[PDB]
Amino acid sequence: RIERIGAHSHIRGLGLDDALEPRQASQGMVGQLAARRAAGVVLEMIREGKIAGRAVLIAGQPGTGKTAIAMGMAQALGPDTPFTAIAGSEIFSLEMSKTEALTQAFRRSIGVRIKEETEIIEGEVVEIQIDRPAKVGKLTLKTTEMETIYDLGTKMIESLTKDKVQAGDVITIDKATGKISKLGRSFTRARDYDAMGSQTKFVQCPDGELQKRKEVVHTVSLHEIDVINSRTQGFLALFSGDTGEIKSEVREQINAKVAEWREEGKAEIIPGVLFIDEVHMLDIESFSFLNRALESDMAPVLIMATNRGITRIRGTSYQSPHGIPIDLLDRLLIVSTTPYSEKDTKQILRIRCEEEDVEMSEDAYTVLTRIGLETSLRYAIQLITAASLVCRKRKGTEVQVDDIKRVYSLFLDESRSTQYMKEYQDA
């Protein structure tokens, strides 16, 4: 519950209507109807997943809400669909090539819902009488509507001895493997032992004696390749990034078995999204790889964001729009974000204030909207926070003009920093 509000916490989805009509202000967003409708339609395409290898480029001036609309789409997509957010400079690893990192990122945003039929027996253990030789045992499971006694085997008795199960424990035994899983207790333990005090759990299902076809959908991403590349996979799946596995017999074989599962009804493919923020940091080799990697059937939807116009492509000398080669730039379609006006700026500032739980006068809102239209929006939020803190220190109830104007001089913007920078501190 203790998680602080970040720069994109004010947004909590992409405000859209039944007909995908964008709204002025909803779900923490304001203005920018065109790019928001583009986000809505690409999100509909993602949730459809019928087509693979689609790319979208979010372009615009800084502070136009590129990362904002990206996080909004991520939120609107909701759980059950992977959304791999990554920065352009994260692919540069000292233990795995750029192409390998891109393959990892692509396969990481693809999920397979594996269906598994289970048969679990549950109930209340009324009698767990076990005859230890130092071989024979019987279990008396009880439910709210029926009871049954089961003769326990040697291995089952040993498993029960492993996980201590006293009378009155709510357990869920899997008839397939016999794994002992304790859920709780139905009553106290004799009220006499001067220890082991806990709370009592609710009774089990009436038909819990034998659940026939308990369906559990195990969801896992296509990053499962780490499970095969090495005999010990947890080390690679948890921390180790040195996963330069062999592409042959791993990628192709896993894809083939995933197709077999999809055809045989075991699992279903759920393509996610790969959001590369500041994609301009990718080397030209990474762009050349994305050009081809984006053509596979397992290719997720590649959302990218650029904050530049004509700029040199990293790893070469010639320039291209958005710092992306002409090929990949032409392949994808671009979503331009128009700057926000004064009203939109004021509304965004008000939404941020509401998020931060801070209140300020109308004149404060006006002067702060002015300052934000002049300097920037993020700087306006910084001033919101600073003025709220100055007001709290001042013992006031709401932020007045005298606090925003004070924190404006206390904290400087880059435009004024460079102005006072004429002291030639260093070069």
Binding site: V42, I51, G53, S97, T99, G178, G244, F289, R331
Partner: protein, 416 residues
């Protein structure tokens, strides 16, 4: 259903009996000379006589060189391996670059080997022990096998009532014998008694590539000696040596071949984005193509006359040096006309599952010939979604117009 891809519409070259390139067939359209050259190339591949040859599918962007190579692969068939590669793939941080290209050349080649495996299955009746005289029982009969100690099982593998299946080089405890009536609740699950004979030999025609054997003999993981387990305990790697690469492997493969044990299956290696490879890659490819054991390689370049990477001083056509560019045949693909653009747009819409009206198709073809064909191809799906939202089953001109208004092409974005 299977999700659509970028090149899932191409099914093959679609040539006539004499190789005549039809206007449109097998998903492809246009590029008659290119598709005829590709027919000749697949004939070469099927010949399985020449080795080390290569071809360059150099052409302007959007001509379909990649889709063309994928159609070539489809036409060739799944038997002959077709290894796709990106120029950036060679750049690795654990294996040498030229060695990456070498292992790619190797994996590109296929090998179909035949082997007879003796399998021992049945419920274990006796497990008395170095050599272990195990007893397997099946519906046919019982046999006391004089198995070797190397197969002695470490895990539970109960002495009795355990169903085991062994083959000569690991054992698999299938499941517990069908004693479900002995106990009412037991952790172990049961399977029926195997009906097949204990000792059975089955011939499996397995298809593998030469690089599989290469990397396997490089760092084997079989055997039972402790030194082996300690060696393969952690950090697998690459960079097989040339002496083991050639020599022993080629000799054993030729042995299997001339003895009827295996059958060589030459494949293809599609090195895409060759225009951005370093000069070292080209210098190694020089000798690679000049080898009696190198497979066919299909290159797909997109750049024109540009500076070769790794030198940043000298320029050459197609970003490939002249000495190499001459070693590979050139396939010149031309740009599609607005008519061909509209035709391929309609083909993709049919494959992609989208219904488009005549006016909508015309507007899409116009937007394509104006900005880019692939741009309209990308706009196809958004228009279908807009139609669905608006309740229209088929796309109309207004839908594609609104889509284009929402999404700006690369050219328009650059104009801004």
């Amino acid at each position: 259903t299977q999700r659509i891809a970028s090149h899932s519409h191409v099914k093959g070259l679609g040539l006539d009996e004499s190789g005549l390139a039809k206007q449109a067939a097998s998903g492809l359209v246009g590029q008659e000379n290119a598709r005829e050259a590709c027919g000749v190339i697949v004939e070469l591949i099927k010949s399985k006589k020449m080795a080390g040859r290569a071809v360059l599918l150099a052409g302007p962007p959007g001509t379909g060189k990649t889709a063309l190579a994928l159609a070539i692969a489809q036409e060739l068939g799944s038997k002959v391996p077709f290894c796709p590669m990106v120029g950036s793939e060679v750049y690795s941080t654990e294996i040498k670059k030229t060695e990456v290209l070498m292992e790619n050349f190797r994996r590109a080649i296929g090998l179909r080997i035949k082997e007879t495996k003796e399998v021992y299955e049945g419920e274990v009746t006796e497990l008395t022990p170095s050599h272990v005289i195990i007893g397997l029982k099946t519906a046919k009969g019982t046999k006391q096998l004089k198995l070797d100690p190397s197969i002695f099982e470490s895990l539970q593998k109960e002495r009795v009532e355990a169903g085991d299946v062994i083959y000569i080089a690991v054992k698999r405890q299938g499941r517990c014998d069908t004693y479900a009536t002995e106990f009412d609740l037991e952790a172990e699950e049961y399977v029926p008694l195997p009906k097949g004979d204990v000792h059975k030999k089955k011939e499996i025609i397995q298809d593998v590539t030469l690089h599989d054997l290469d990397v396997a003999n490089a760092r084997p993981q079989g055997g039972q000696d402790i030194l082996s387990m300690m060696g393969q305990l952690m950090k697998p790697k690459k960079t097989e040596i040339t002496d083991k690469l050639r020599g022993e492997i080629n000799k054993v493969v030729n042995k299997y071949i001339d003895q009827g044990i295996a059958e060589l299956v030459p494949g293809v290696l599609f090195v895409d984005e060759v225009h951005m490879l370093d000069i070292e890659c080209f210098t190694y490819l020089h000798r690679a193509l000049e080898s009696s054991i190198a497979p066919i390689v299909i290159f797909a370049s997109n750049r024109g006359n540009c500076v070769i990477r790794g030198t940043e001083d000298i320029t050459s056509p197609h970003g490939i040096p002249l000495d190499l560019l001459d070693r590979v045949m050139i396939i010149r693909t031309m740009l599609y006309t607005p008519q061909e653009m509209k035709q391929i747009i309609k083909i993709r819409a049919q494959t992609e599952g989208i219904n488009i009206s005549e006016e909508a198709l015309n507007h899409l073809g116009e937007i394509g010939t104006k900005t880019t064909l692939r741009y309209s191809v990308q706009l196809l799906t958004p228009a279908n979604l807009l139609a669905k939202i608006n309740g229209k089953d088929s796309i109309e001109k207004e839908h594609v117009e609104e889509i284009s208004e929402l999404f700006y092409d690369a050219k328009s974005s650059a104009k801004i």
